[PDB]
Amino acid sequence: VKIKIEHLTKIFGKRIKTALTMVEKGEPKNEILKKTGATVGVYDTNFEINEGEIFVIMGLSGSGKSTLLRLLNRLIEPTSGKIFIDNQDVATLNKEDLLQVRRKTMSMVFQNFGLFPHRTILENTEYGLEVQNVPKEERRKRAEKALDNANLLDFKDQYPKQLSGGMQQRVGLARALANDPEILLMDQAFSALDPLIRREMQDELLELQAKFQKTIIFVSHDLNEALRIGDRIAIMKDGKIMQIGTGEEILTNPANDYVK
Amino acid sequence: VKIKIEHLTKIFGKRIKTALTMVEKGEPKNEILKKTGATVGVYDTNFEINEGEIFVIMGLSGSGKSTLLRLLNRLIEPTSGKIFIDNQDVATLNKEDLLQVRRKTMSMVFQNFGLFPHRTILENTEYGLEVQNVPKEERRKRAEKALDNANLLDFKDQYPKQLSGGMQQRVGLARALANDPEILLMDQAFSALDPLIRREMQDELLELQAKFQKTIIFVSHDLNEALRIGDRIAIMKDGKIMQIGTGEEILTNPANDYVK
Amino acid sequence: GQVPIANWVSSATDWITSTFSSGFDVIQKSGTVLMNGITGALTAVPFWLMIAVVTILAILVSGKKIAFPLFTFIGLSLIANQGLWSDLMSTITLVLLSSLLSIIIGVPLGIWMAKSDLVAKIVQPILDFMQTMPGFVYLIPAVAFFGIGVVPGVFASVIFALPPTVRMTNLGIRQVSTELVEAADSFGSTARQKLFKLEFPLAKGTIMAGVNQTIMLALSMVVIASMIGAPGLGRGVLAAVQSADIGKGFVSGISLVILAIIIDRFTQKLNVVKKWKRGIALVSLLALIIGAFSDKKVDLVYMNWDSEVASINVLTQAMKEHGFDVKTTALDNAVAWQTVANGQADGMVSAWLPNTHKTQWQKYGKSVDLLGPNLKGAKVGFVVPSYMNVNSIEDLTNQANKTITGIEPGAGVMAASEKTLNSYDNLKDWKLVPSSSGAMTVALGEAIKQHKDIVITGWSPHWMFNKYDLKYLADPKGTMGTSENINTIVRKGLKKENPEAYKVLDKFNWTTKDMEAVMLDIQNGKTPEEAAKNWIKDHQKEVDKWF
Amino acid sequence: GQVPIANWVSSATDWITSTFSSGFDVIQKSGTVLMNGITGALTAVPFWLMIAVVTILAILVSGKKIAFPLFTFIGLSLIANQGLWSDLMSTITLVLLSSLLSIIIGVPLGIWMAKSDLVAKIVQPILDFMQTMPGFVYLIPAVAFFGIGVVPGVFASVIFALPPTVRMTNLGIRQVSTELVEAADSFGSTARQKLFKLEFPLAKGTIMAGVNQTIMLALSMVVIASMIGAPGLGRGVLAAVQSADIGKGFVSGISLVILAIIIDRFTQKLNVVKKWKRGIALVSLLALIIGAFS
């Protein structure tokens, strides 16, 4: 076991008290927003992620996926609940240990690619290594190798504004990989990729996990890839989990036309 | 016939002369970038789009799709070639006629959603109507109707930073639709959508074209949707077209492992 | 100076102000009457009512916080206590005019700079010039065109406070994302609509920082406006500097600071119950307006020195209680001389001739009329505290670290001091540091406190000899000064237009002892007008003699 | 009035100057000797050599465009011709010290003002005070504390030129996109690295605008410094004002404006073959050192 999540909850806006009460009754998200304006990002999310596992997360746009990934990295704090990473509540971590965790344990990939315009690809790709005080030489080469795996080594000297959506997405992905952490949080890193390069990246991930038994959380909307690589799948709706199976979801499901 | 494109070409960076010569010989894109740093966005793109047709465009990330859409709307000017829209070279249009064209003839949807943070959804969704001097009442209601079709009517009072990727994408899409133009340029408006809502939007588009015989250019990376709705398909690589068929591509193709 | 830029500029300025007087005369009159009416309206409304209204508006604009409103009430009531209400009203007048014009001419200009990469480079150096060039240099021609009053203060504040608004507006219009601009172009947004819907709202941060900068600069540029007749707290600052009294200077400055913070808060509340609130605000403004709705002459110009203050106040009273309506204006020296020369002012009684204002008399003189001395007994020379052994210049050996203290460059006193340092030998190796009069007075005060030796280039009459105990130094060679006289000055053409006051000014005369008595009366605390009343009651026959 | 603020202020300044005399005199002597030595070194460098070196540096910094180096050469030649070289050197040392101190105390202050919403609300009134209070009232206490010379001018110029840098630094560091900040945090980047790598390089626009404002305000606060003994071109303006000769005042003001433009252009060239340019600039510095020795 690598990660635990217990009664995790994060509610945005204000009037959080009445909204939390409403969900405690079990009212839907839209009515709660109508009364209070507080959009329940995620409610009573409780589960476990083991090591060397591609925990794919899936759900409707507006179901609380990116929020969960952010909470795991504690970029935002929940209103109620506990996130344990190696038997260590991230909310009870002093800045130094949190920093070591964010550098080595887990690295994140965003929907918007979180890219620095003022830095080339080779300087964004090795940002996660500069902060670790890695020398110029090894980090330079690790970034180059990651880009070559992502088919961007010819653009290493260019800037993001000189690039498209797919190449920027691959840049974010490589920046996450170059750091070679023990956990890879990934929020739709394949949304803007062609099938061929998408499958290249899937094979990349499978190789990584096979050799380096490495935890990966992979948000996705494509059923095909989740089944191909997802050793375990979690489906979300309106901020709550509905099933956390691997391949039985296609056989047994509570009104999941999501699959068909 | 609605649109013509003849020897359309757009080359970025500088040293455009030698790069254009190189492509005239037929050298690849990466070698050209290596020597000159000029990335050939698109080369000798020549084709025709008829009215009431979903011309789907598809290709590898880094093949010149968004550039073509931008050129059609003349957000950027080509280095060589002609774009005709209703027998009217957009490059020879005074500002007033260009403005009427951009308001009524064609509306665009971007990969990055092109959203205004300082404006609510209901104020971004009706931006294309404010500029047309439409009254508050009709534009307000058209925007609301579009959002309801996009399942965002509960978030009409929120701001994009209070929203996710999928909802912002649907906002851009609705803003394009609310204007009800004769041409819909769309650059991966379904990349960040779940299958169910994606299929809702596909049915939306098919309804629009069936009733209102309306031209739609729809960039995509998903095989499934292009075949479902694409009345005609164009595939791109390294900045050049390779086939512009509708469904024969799956039967006959020059080394298009791109498709199954 | 091989290249004669000085002569070119002087000739050009003379020619231009000789050719372009009419239209500028009409506009200066119009703006002066407008600004005077504004200030009169703002002063008619009682201070309590305006304080209540401003704190009310602060409450409405702040919401549930109570910092800004309480600060407003506290500061404004404090100012009303210190007696700086009317000055505050005049300062509000000129500051709002300067800021409004500056913003209006900057934001459009900043946008133009942002939409044309040419105009940016064509205007940036102009902004550098306007913002960095000393305001004094074009102060004198500004007085030539716009004349004394609020108008040139407005002009200078404008051309000193416009650059920041412009620069940050340009940045804000240039620092907005290009993707959103592409999105707005794709939807047929004219530059106007894209400017009002996308550009301005996103650039408001930088633009409003620029506006705050503009307001602070225009509030700093009050003294540079108050030395050319503009009323307000700048006059208080200048009179405190002359008196070397940091109390009054700090009070006026802190009043300016309070006004700056008030305006800045009320403006920053424009970056990002409602009907009740708005109706209450309109009712407050209506109440302000309701509350507001509740012969021979002569215009004189004088300087912010105690001597001339006493003289001019005495003259003004003698005129008023003998059938006049006087308009006395406190200016700088050279500004006053220019105003008299150009005929805008009907004369001045402050010509410390022929050794102190010799440069001014020489440059002018062909465009004024010297009516003769009005007080004899004035002296100029080196001055040392009365407690020092030294009693003549010939005995100066190593005092004041072989360093004289000056008054201001170019003043006839400093030229005479340079001549003295070359005529003698004991102090050939001494120095002469040019400073301002305020710095000299403050240094003198501190040295007296610390009992340390000091030598200054001073004159009598002056408050130094009354507030501190000093002594002149002997000048056997007479290179420094010989009991110069204060002389009256009028504009060329008063004998024909207002002779009823020419008689007074040519017949005006009264002794230095009286001036020292009046200054002594003032320093104890009495206002100058009361001092004039007292001394005229004691010396009525002389007053009647002047008429 | 009824509340004797004036008496309290006078008592406070009397007490502080009678108590802090040692420090004030020490800093007066040290700053005066140091700055006069700087001016001596600058003046000993012949004016033609200084003009040549600065023009070459402008050439190197501008690439091929010549309008800026040409204007620099022309302006400095005009100044040296009118005899305002030593005055210009004094003005340079004063302005450079003032702007340097203002930047050093503003950029960190603005940064720590961005990281705290309490410090912002505590410092905004202070900046408003330091920028709205007339420089005439800073003439009295600085003279009373430091005494006539150069240091009081630096003190006042700093007081009047800090606010722009402070405000613009705060604004630029408060404007960087939250997404980039989240990205940097997610890779474990301390405030130091997140500041030297992300916020500052993107806020450089506003920061350098504030620096330009700082420099222009310091230059405008030169007459007020020459009114408290600070030598330089303010003395020329004051002499022109008293003598009412617009020509000499204008010449001094144009020298000021030329200096402002040159400094502003050099600073702006910091916002955004190089080995050879570095080598040539090093050679020029060595020549300047020889000239100081010569």
Ligand SMILES: Nc1ncnc2c1ncn2[C@@H]1O[C@H](COP(=O)(O)OP(=O)(O)OP(=O)(O)O)[C@@H](O)[C@H]1O
């Ligand atoms: N900064 C914010 N302030 C308020 N609410 C927010 C904020 N960021 C996200 N939310 C809320 O979080 C909820 C889910 O956010 P999430 O980003 O998890 O949507 P998504 O599931 O990520 O959509 P997609 O999966 O297509 O990205 C949304 O309903 C949104 O309202």
Ligand SMILES: Nc1ncnc2c1ncn2[C@@H]1O[C@H](COP(=O)(O)OP(=O)(O)OP(=O)(O)O)[C@@H](O)[C@H]1O
């Ligand atoms: N502003 C720019 N400056 C220089 N080159 C650019 C610029 N914008 C785009 N390009 C070039 O355009 C080429 C294609 O751009 P495009 O946006 O067409 O890629 P894409 O095909 O859109 O990728 P995806 O389809 O995954 O978005 C890229 O190779 C990129 O280098």
